[PDB]
Amino acid sequence: QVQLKESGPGLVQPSQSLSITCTVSGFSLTTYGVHWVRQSPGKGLEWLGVIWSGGSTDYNAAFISRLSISKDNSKSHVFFKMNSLQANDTAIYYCARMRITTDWFAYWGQGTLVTVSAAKTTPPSVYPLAPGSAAQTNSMVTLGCLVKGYFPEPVTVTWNSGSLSSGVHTFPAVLQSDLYTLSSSVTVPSSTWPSETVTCNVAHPASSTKVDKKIVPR
């Protein structure tokens, strides 16, 4: 059916530019305008600009100096280019058909997550989290894994090679300095640990590292 396909980078170096292509299908760029929007945690959804069916553009005034949008009608391509990116430009970017007059064709692209950083690829340190020596006993016990100092995202954390899946919580990564850190926890019946071994498996495809850490009593 009707679709907008986005293509562009996951990572942009600070001061460098961000090029995204939106490929339209199901309708003609000669017929409708295409808008660009971004979404960040801090700022919410922000409209960036539009290229109208007729070929003219309008831009959000807070971006007009470093923003540009053009299109190729024949190949159904819309081109988005933003210059001089900085850390606060980290966001998901979307092309969208919006400001709708008719009952048809209104769809947004799968967004492009763009991370702005000068970090280099860095494998994680992986640390097991066993309960303290004197921690109080429950019918359940929580264990954990701390994954620290990696770049870029993502890592994938699994427990017992994915065999332990229920009672798992893996938290979003957060920027610590210019590297990422996350933790994951698993909860098992108290009777099963340490008698039944529990190991976190942490993969980081960008550094080709795969590390297992058994959680051992301290």
Binding site: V37, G44, T101, P131, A134, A135, F171, Q176, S183
Partner: protein, 218 residues
């Protein structure tokens, strides 16, 4: 720029309830070529926003009849006759009348449930980390509802602000609870200077904080 102000910021609902969400603009949203460009979007976890209503009250195709929009001038309303599970997510109003076009800040529609106190767990630095010269204390606060929660760190009973990084999950799709991690990062030297480490959680389920603690000497 035109401010779009949404109310409420979050709306707990159970399935089968009615729901009403409001959006107020800082200016009259005037027609353009006889069209009033006021739209409502729903964004589910991990997906792009999808158009629900365009031109104030027109249901986009595929959008079920339980959705309706109304309003004029500065005041607009999205109504849901009868909430289904697939209606959970973040709703945004959008105005396409005055450049720069602008979105509301979002209203999260979320599923109401029985109250749950968080399961709190605290973990001393791993000895692997200690050898590297770092010391992260980790606290997991898992499977709580409602979402409001505050975490306080204490070192020898003295409130600790610096070096704390928190990470929250979104509402779990299965049990509808929330989870949070809190990590206090210190140098190894700093860690050694102190004996007692406490994570204190304040949650609606009680006035008395949930305290978990360990002592560096055991």
């Amino acid at each position: 720029d035109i401010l779009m102000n949404q109310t409420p910021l979050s709306l707990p609902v159970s399935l089968g309830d009615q729901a009403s969400i409001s959006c107020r603009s800082s200016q009259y949203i005037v027609h353009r070529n006889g069209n009033t460009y006021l739209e409502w979007y729903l964004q589910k976890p991990g997906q792009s926003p999808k158009l629900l209503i365009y031109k104030v009250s027109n249901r986009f195709s595929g959008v079920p009849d339980r959705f309706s929009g109304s309003g004029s001038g500065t005041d607009f309303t999205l109504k849901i006759s009868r909430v289904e599970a697939e209606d959970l997510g973040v709703y945004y109003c959008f105005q396409g009348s005055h450049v720069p076009y602008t979105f509301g800040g979002g209203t999260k529609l979320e599923l109401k449930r029985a109250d749950a106190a968080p399961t709190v767990s605290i973990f001393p630095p791993s000895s692997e980390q200690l050898t590297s010269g770092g010391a992260s204390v980790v606290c997991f606060l898992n499977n709580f509802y409602p979402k409001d929660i505050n975490v306080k760190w204490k070192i020898d009973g003295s409130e600790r602000q610096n070096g704390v990084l928190n990470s929250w999950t979104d509402q779990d799709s299965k049990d509808s609870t929330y989870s949070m991690s809190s990590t206090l990062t210190l140098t190894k030297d700093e860690y050694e200077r102190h004996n007692s480490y406490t994570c204190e959680a304040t949650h609606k389920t009680s006035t008395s904080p949930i305290v978990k603690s360990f002592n560096r000497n055991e």
